Amino acid sequence: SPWRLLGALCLQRPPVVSKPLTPLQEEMASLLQQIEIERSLYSDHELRALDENQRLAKKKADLAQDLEDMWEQKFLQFKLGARITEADEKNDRTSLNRKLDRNLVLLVREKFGDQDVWILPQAEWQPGETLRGTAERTLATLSENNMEAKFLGNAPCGHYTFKFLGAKVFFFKALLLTGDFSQAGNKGHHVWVTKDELGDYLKPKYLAQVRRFVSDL
Amino acid sequence: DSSRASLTRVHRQAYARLYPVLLVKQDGSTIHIRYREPRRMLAMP
Amino acid sequence: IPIEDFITPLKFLDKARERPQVELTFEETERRALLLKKWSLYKQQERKMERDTIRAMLEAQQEALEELQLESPKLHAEAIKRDPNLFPFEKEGPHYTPP
């Protein structure tokens, strides 16, 4: 009973920035803030304004404004980080700083002799070794950089079956911490791809069953 | 999926105002923190 | 010995005469009711979405496990158990503005 030994290596990248906000959530936050204001009582700023103005009027008939002005000036002078990062490039799709709002999966294009499709970076395992060890070895060899792929568990994800001699594919995921990719100008077609781009790039059924267990958000 | 725990509310009965203040860490990132005194910038070394 | 912290301080009982009144209107109440209904519907939709995604992930994991069991009666013993690696696991939250 011959069985060809293959695998798979899907990359998991945590998002940096949050998803955009909807108007109904804005109205909900506004009404929650109004309820918080109506429920709050005896605050430091409220007193430091009210009793201070009362003392001012009393000693005039016989702080806070400058402080909030300085606060507004310091807020206007300090410019926060520009969140506009997915629209100023629109070309460098294989960059780490491309998408920072959702999850990104990495895949490498490889043209074989009988097959000419865009398969996820597989992982060949040997009977003399384990499975996760061979998977992480193949992930380290196909990445040619210094990365920290923290696996979320020894259990697999999804399996398939294709014959012509039997074969099998073992999917494995690992959480990525930092991104120290050396030499981003390699000839390997490793592009950071999210969800919609992933569903648009693939074509056969062996890849259409991958978007069912990935974090769709 | 980061908005499920964003719209919050203080369930306590007696409390003061918690203005949405911003704070920058030792790298460059702001965060909305509900804290009194309507400050704008917190330079934490 | 755990120290209780939810106890309100002593400065929460001497002062309580600032904003005792609350004035609204019928339009504000009906708008708040409509917004709460819409938010409840949105939360129910998100809960159903999470439920179906979790069910899909679980059935995919079960299919992968049963295929690995029927294709290899040895790798399951080393794939089901977890090696000591996620003991000091940590994941810091996302950010608002990039560095």
Add this chain to the structure above:
Amino acid sequence: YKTKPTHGIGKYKHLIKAEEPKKKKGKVEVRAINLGTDYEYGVLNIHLTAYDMTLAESYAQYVHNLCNSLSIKVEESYAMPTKTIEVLQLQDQGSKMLLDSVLTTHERVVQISGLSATFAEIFLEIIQSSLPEGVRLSVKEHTEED
């Protein structure tokens, strides 16, 4: 009656296991049941430390409702006292005058009993995928004293 066919019909303590034990000071945690083809870890300890209190409380409520709806037993969830921290502020033209600020820091703790490999990995990936802004996760062990 003992001889009648209706014997043992009013029995009810055999269907319950709560023997009213002293669970306030008992430090008997379940060990990680290792076997190979059936992995089962003991009790963990999830930490949600942040600067805001209401965010941590909401996240704790959400994760508790999630683990209640996912059919997994929960030990006990408590909270530790906050730690006040001062933020020194040096003057611009004067490198000798230092000021001080006040900020809060809270943290919540939740525990789950049964965590099989697939179920625990799905739970942790769902937690990290729906991780809100501000808080941070740092799972430790059950031997964390106060």
Add this chain to the structure above:
RNA sequence: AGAGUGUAGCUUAAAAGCACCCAACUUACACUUAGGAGAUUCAAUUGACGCUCUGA
């Protein structure tokens, strides 16, 4: 290309009973109260629009 099928997540239910979420109490879970969204895919026991399996 063939087969299994057919009431929302479930029914040896015929438009109901179980489920879900939000608002009030709770460190927290939870009861309770106050509310919300849900279905017989089509033309008269028949044939075809949706899912799965067996293939190439």
